[PDB]
Structures are given as C-alpha cells and as structure tokens.
C-alpha cells in the first residue's frame, strides 16, 4: 500500500570551510494509543535547534513556540481550509500510514539470541542480542532466587537496523551446587528464555 506524506505549509512572502550554517527541520509526529483508538498529530517546525511554531491536533491550530514562530502561527491560522486539512490529517495521514505499515512494524517480532559467559571472583555476562521490539526484561537468578544486587546493565541498545541488544552482568562468588540462570522475557516468546551457568 502507498504511504502518504504530509506537506509543510509555505510561509508568507515579503582545505576548509568556515561559513556559518542555517538549519530548518520539519517533523510530523503521529502518536498512537491503543492502536488507532486515540491519535494525536504533532507538527514541529524547527529553526537551527529551536522549535519555533507547532501544530498540535489536540489544540486544533498553530501556536507560536518562540517569538520567531509568531507570524507563521498567525499567517497559517488565517487559512481556514488549511487548518481543517491538518485537523483531518489524524485520519487521512496518521491512521492511514499506521494501517499501511502495521504488519511489518507494530507486528514485528524477532527472538533474542541469549548467551552466558564469564568476562568475590566471577563476573557473568548475559548477552541478549538481535531482538525486536525493545520492550524486554532480563533477570538473574541464583538457584531459585532472583538477584538484583551486584548487577550492571548497559540498558537497551538500539542497533539502528530494527534490532536491539543488551548486556546484563552479575557478580558472583560461586559456591558448590550453585546454578546461575539468566532469564529473558520478550514478546517474541510465550515462555521465558533461560540459560544456565555453573
């Protein structure tokens, strides 16, 4: 299916490199709650690094963020057909694009590969790689007991390629009979993934 694009409104008309730069950024943000049940559109216009003017579907019109954005907010708000265009965009654009890409974004699931290996005495690494989506839980167990002390985590690392990874390490003073378990809980699998080390 064809993804739709939103179109920025035009503003009103009146060896080395040491030249200054000028940056204009435009963002249309479609925010989805419970699928397309609740949808908010946020159009952000940004000069250099400062958002100057925005459209917020919950407000229904442009609002100046800085004094710089003021004439745009007023010029665009003076165009009634344009505003109702943007107002309807939550359907014609956000809900539409959500529908087009749903199957390979929202429904995307890739199973993590989980390994355990050594790096008081012994530091254990639970490596959890190449999964999607990011929402996940990694838990360490000593025999039957969950251990949260002496644990260090990188946190969620986004690989840039629609995969994530994370490394969670556990300081151990290993004893006789101790089984250490790394447990992973992720939407890709119904049961937990567990890997044991002795």
């Amino acid at each position: 299916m064809k993804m739709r694009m939103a179109t920025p409104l035009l503003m009103q008309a009146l060896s080395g490199d040491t030249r200054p730069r000028f940056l204009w950024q435009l963002k249309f943000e479609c925010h989805f709650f419970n699928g397309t049940e609740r949808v908010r559109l946020l159009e952000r216009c940004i000069y250099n690094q400062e958002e100057s003017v925005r459209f917020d579907s919950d407000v229904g019109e442009y609002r100046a963020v800085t004094e710089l954005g003021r004439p745009d907010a007023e010029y665009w708000n003076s165009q009634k057909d344009l505003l109702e265009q943007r107002r309807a965009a939550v359907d014609t654009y956000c809900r539409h694009n959500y529908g087009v890409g749903e199957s390979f974004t929202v429904q995307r699931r890739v199973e993590p590969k989980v390994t355990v290996y050594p790096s008081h005495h012994n530091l254990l690494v639970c490596s959890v790689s190449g999964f999607y989506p990011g929402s996940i839980e990694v838990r360490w167990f000593r025999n039957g007991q969950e251990e949260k002390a002496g644990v260090v985590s990188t946190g969620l690392i986004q690989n840039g390629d629609w995969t994530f990874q994370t490394l969670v390490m556990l300081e151990t003073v290993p004893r006789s009979g101790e089984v250490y378990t790394c447990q992973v809980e992720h939407p890709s699998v119904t049961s937990p993934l567990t890997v044991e080390w002795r």
């Binding site: 000028f22 925010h31 710089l68 390979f104 840039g160």
Partner: protein, 177 residues
C-alpha cells in the same frame, strides 16, 4: 503506544536536504534526493509498502524556501555547532573467526554534517561498510550509524574516526578483541 515521525530538513549553505520516516526510533525509509528513489531501511519493507519519492523533492523545495525566509527573519543568526558523542560496539559477542559487525554510533550532534572513517591497523577501510542517513532526536539533535563487517582476529585493531565542526580535533573511538 507507538510513534511515527516524518522528519525533513534543509541545510544552508550546503544545500542538503533529507526526508525520512521513523517508527519508534527506527528508520522505515528515506528518499535518495539524487536518484529520486525510495530507499527502504530493510529491503523486505518494499515488498509490502510503497512511497512516491517525487513528493519528498517538492516538500524539500518548500523547506528550502522557508529556511531562507527564517534565516532573513532571524537576521542571519547561525546554528551553534553541537559536537557528537561517539560509541563503538559490536553487533554480537565476539567469537574468533565468527563474522561480526562493528557499529559506530554517532549521537547528539548538529548541524547534520559529519565525516566518518573506519580505520583498521591505522588504515582506512571501505570494503563492505554502510551507513544510515541522519536520524531525528526529540531534542532536535541528530543520530547516525556506520557499520563495518569484519572477521575477528587477535591481531587487528580498529578505529572509527569522526569529524564535525563542533570538535576541535577529529574524534577517534578505538576497539579491539
């Protein structure tokens, strides 16, 4: 809860534009401005969805026009360079002679212009490298990934060298087995 972002920019005087979609922080696609072509971030996406590339060029033209208006309206106030922080890491745990990928993560910078070199034992390498376009951040800075596939050895070292107008020296992030 999910977020889809259509992010565009134009930059003067480089006269550089970009146009991309982001889903929860990952790029869905961008448009090659030169080829007038839709470039899906994962090839498989183009099997389910399509996008009319020509429209991005029209959007970018409007952005350019608007940038020029705002530049004059600001009375030529220029951007303040924000240098990047850079992290080098591998795609997976490193096993000898199991092929892997070096990731160079370039984060929290603006304006969106960088020069990235992969170094191996002090020498530039280009074989098999790839990169992403400039990815948006909530604070309106940028992200970017560069990749270098490689075979792990106990005798190679690597560097990702990154240059940006906000750094006093080229930044160099080392990695080795």
């Amino acid at each position: 809860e999910h977020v889809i972002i259509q992010a565009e920019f134009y930059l003067n005087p480089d006269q550089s534009g970009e146009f991309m979609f982001d889903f929860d922080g990952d790029e869905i696609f961008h448009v090659d401005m030169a080829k007038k072509e839709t470039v899906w971030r994962l090839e498989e996406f183009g099997r389910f969805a399509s996008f009319e590339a020509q429209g991005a060029l029209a959007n970018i033209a409007v952005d350019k026009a608007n940038l020029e208006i705002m530049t004059k309206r600001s009375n030529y106030t220029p951007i303040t360079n924000v240098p990047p922080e850079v992290t080098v890491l591998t795609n997976s745990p490193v096993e000898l002679r199991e092929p892997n990928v070096l990731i160079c993560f370039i984060d929290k910078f603006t304006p969106p212009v960088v020069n990235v070199t992969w170094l191996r034992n002090g020498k530039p390498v280009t074989t098999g490298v790839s990169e992403t376009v400039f990815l948006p951040r909530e604070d309106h800075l940028f992200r970017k990934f560069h990749y270098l596939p490689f075979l792990p050895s106990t005798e190679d070292v690597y560097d990702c060298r990154v240059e940006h107008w906000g750094l006093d020296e080229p930044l160099l992030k080392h990695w080795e087995f």
